[PDB]
């Protein structure tokens, strides 16, 4: 089996860097620092990054470069009993793309809207406004701000929907934007990594261009320093609370994104003897250092808001699409040279989203290609196939009720799935396959065994830190709601179906691919425990 290789090494590094650094670096990590003790949040975040995140990040990268195949085949060739870990992970990626791509479309619809002398979301006297319109954020829900009203009444038209049952009309001015984001991935992924590794040059490096000029802009702002206090000023009593230790753990895991077969896939196109330990440590550090930089560009202007604009930090220090689509653009409309800072900011949102979706799909193409030879044969027209299923189910997120669709998939489709799909990923390679064999594997590639530190981290703290996240993520489960809208009972259930449908194939394939092989029980448990390498 002779497979394509990276036409240059930084092609791989940028594609990994681009996949790892994404929206969560800018629209969640800063809020977590502000909410969990500032600089004192970096200690539990640093520890859960050393024992939790990087070991999982390092492992998948080594697994990719070593077994030279995508997620489906790779996990089949490791523990045949757990080949459904492959199918689960490619299903989670699949579900994720049904919803994670509209955030890119939102940031593009704003990009097109910033071509004017006066940006449309600054005043409260347009067709789409209400008497409850205030200039900026406040304590109360019923009286929203001018940018809150531009997003929910002109872009989404969310107010014209009575819930998930009423998607209503279909936003034809915005279904277009989701079409643009799907071409830019086509013309960069149909030719393999030959062109993908080249496109990521722009979309993984442009964020740092945008981060730099927005950093120098936000720092030479009245009240800039004030924000940096709200961001880093220590409060070490946070360290004592398990919530920041959980918030650290869950932020570290989801922001590094190991397990989806994307780092598997990206590394599976590497030269076998590449120093993957160096690549893991470097790119994982770029990911966290980017978040630190991102907090300064975010909270500097957040400070310019509490000073020059007179708002509570409580009312503007948020996270998620609220921060990048209502509050931060509201600052932009006020500053001088306003519309310039908006264009490069919304491109930063788009370029931060594209590389990270390049990874999720590539996890699919190189997992399906390397398992079925027919699909590998016509990659250019298979990557045309699923990019139509993503777009057709994707106009649902483009209806007036599209946000109700996006939110349901956000809390259900992949969040709970991948956590247990990786917990099984963890103890599969660490106890079934063994750290004995795994240390042997990377010593043969890079020349030295991983220290005892990495294997005790892979064997003990990896599943605990995983359970520590899953437990925390469960005790914060209320039935799904948004604002005054409580979803119907059946919508919570269908969400649990999308969550289970991916990870159900863990014991499925197991049970299927168990009886399907011959022999007695124990005499067959070892047939599905003997790895593909140990067979030749």
């Amino acid at each position: 089996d002779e497979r394509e290789t990276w036409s240059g090494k930084v092609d791989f590094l940028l594609s990994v860097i681009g996949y790892a650094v994404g929206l969560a670096n800018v629209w969640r990590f800063p809020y977590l620092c502000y909410k969990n003790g500032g600089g004192a949040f970096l200690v539990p975040y640093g520890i859960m990054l050393a024992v939790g995140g990087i070991p999982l990040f390092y492992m998948e990268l080594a697994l990719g470069q070593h077994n030279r195949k995508g997620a489906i085949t790779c996990w089949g060739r490791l523990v045949p009993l757990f080949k459904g870990i492959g199918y689960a992970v490619v299903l989670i990626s699949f579900y994720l793309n049904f919803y994670y791509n509209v955030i890119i479309a939102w940031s593009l619809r704003f990009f097109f809207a910033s071509f004017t002398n006066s940006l449309p979301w600054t005043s409260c006297n347009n067709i789409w406004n209400t008497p409850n319109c205030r200039p900026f954020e406040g304590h109360v829900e019923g009286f929203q701000s001018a940018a809150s009203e531009y997003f929910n009444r002109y872009i989404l038209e969310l107010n014209r929907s009575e819930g998930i049952h009423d998607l209503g009309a279909i936003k034809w001015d915005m279904a277009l934007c989701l079409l643009i984001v799907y071409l830019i991935c086509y013309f960069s992924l149909w030719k393999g990594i030959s062109t993908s590794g080249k496109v990521v040059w722009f979309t993984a490096l442009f964020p740092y261009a945008a981060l730099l000029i927005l950093l120098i802009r936000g720092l030479t702002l009245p009240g800039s320093f004030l924000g940096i206090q709200y961001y880093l000023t220590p409060n070490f009593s946070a360290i004592y609370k398990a919530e920041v230790w959980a918030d650290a753990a869950t932020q570290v895991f989801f922001s590094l994104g190991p397990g989806l077969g994307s780092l598997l896939a990206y590394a599976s196109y590497n030269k076998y003897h590449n120093n993957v330990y160096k690549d893991a440590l470097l790119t994982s550090f770029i990911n966290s250092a980017t978040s630190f930089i991102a907090g300064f560009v975010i909270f500097s202007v957040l400070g310019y808001m509490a000073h020059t604009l007179g708002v509570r930090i409580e009312d503007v220090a948020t996270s998620g699409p609220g921060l990048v689509f209502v509050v931060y653009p509201a600052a932009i409309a006020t500053m001088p040279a306003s519309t310039f800072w908006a264009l490069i900011f919304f491109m930063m949102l788009a370029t931060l989203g594209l590389d990270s979706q390049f990874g999720t799909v590539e996890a699919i193409i190189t997992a399906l290609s390397d398992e079925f030879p027919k699909i590998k044969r016509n990659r250019e027209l298979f990557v045309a196939g699923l990019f139509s299923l993503y777009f057709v189910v994707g106009l649902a997120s483009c209806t007036q009720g599209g946000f109700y669709f996006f939110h349901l998939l956000d809390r259900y489709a992949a969040g709970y799935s991948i956590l247990v799909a990786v917990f099984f990923e963890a103890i599969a390679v660490s106890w079934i396959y063994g750290t004995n064999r795994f240390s042997e594997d990377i010593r043969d590639m890079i020349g030295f065994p991983p220290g005892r530190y990495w294997q005790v981290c892979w064997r003990f703290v990896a599943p605990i830190f995983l359970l520590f996240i899953t437990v925390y993520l469960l005790i914060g489960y209320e039935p799904l709601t948004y604002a005054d809208y409580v979803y119907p009972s059946w919508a919570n259930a269908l969400g649990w179906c999308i969550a289970g449908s991916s990870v159900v194939m863990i014991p499925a394939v197991a049970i299927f691919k168990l009886l399907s092989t011959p022999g007695s029980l124990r005499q067959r448990f070892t047939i599905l425990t003997t790895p593909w390498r140990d067979q030749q």
Partner: antibody
Framework: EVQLVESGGGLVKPGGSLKLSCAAS????????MSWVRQSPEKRLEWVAE????????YYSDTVTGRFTISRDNARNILHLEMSSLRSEDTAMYYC????????????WGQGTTLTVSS | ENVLTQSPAIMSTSPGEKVTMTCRAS???????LHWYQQKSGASPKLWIY???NLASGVPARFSGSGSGTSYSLTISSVEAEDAATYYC?????????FGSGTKLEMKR
């Protein structure tokens, strides 16, 4: 504390077949790549074969490939080299040497067992 | 196969001299993978210098190593009478693993 002793070895005829063994003591033999390296009477050092920590990776000298076979026993802590089709050029002292990490070379070397293949 | 020839084959020196033996590789070798062994007569080689320049345990500080790519060298800064031995360079960067021709340290008199 760490100790390597080789054995087997002696006069053997061309085409003949012998098997050496190394006896690791004083360290977890199971977690270390091992290598046989031989020294001709001209004192030329020549590496022969390497077996990884769990036997799942094997490399051979080309002048020795096809005829020699290297093996471990991590239960009894013993490394093996069994040879057939012995040409006379294979006469040497046979050193068995610990060498897990490549970036650090062969930490420990045995005392050697000498094999003259001659008629 | 990457042949490493050393020079000089026999180096005659005095306890006090400052000597340097070189190791020229037919093909380039990474600095992490070139090593040095000392073998006193009637005994087995001891790892002397690993990764071009790091000294094993109990290697006197008078020894040093340097080089890159195709050319490396072992340097004794002030030879003592106990450095009479044979010194081998070995590459660990590709298979087959290869050793050097050897440099033998003999004492002048």
């Amino acid at each position: 504390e760490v100790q390597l002793v080789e054995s087997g070895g002696g006069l053997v005829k061309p085409g003949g077949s012998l098997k050496l063994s190394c006896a690791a003591s004083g360290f977890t033999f199971s977690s270390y790549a091992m290598s046989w390296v031989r020294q001709s009477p001209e004192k030329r050092l020549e590496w022969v074969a390497e077996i990884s920590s769990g036997g799942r990776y094997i490399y051979y000298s080309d002048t020795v490939t096809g005829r020699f076979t290297i093996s471990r026993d991590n239960a009894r802590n013993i490394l093996h080299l069994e040879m057939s089709s012995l040409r006379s050029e294979d006469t040497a002292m046979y050193y068995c040497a610990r060498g897990e990490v490549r970036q650090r070379g062969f930490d420990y070397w045995g005392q050697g067992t000498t094999l003259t293949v001659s008629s | 196969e990457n042949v490493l020839t050393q020079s000089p084959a026999i180096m005659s020196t005095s306890p006090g001299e400052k000597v340097t033996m070189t190791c020229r590789a037919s093909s380039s070798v990474g600095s992490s993978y070139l090593h040095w062994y000392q073998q006193k007569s009637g005994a087995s080689p001891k790892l002397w210098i690993y990764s071009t320049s790091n000294l094993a345990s109990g290697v006197p500080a008078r020894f040093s190593g340097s080089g890159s790519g195709t050319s490396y060298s072992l340097t004794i800064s002030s030879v003592e009478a106990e450095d009479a031995a044979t010194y081998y360079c070995q590459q660990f960067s590709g298979y087959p693993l290869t050793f050097g021709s050897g440099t033998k340290l003999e004492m002048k008199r």
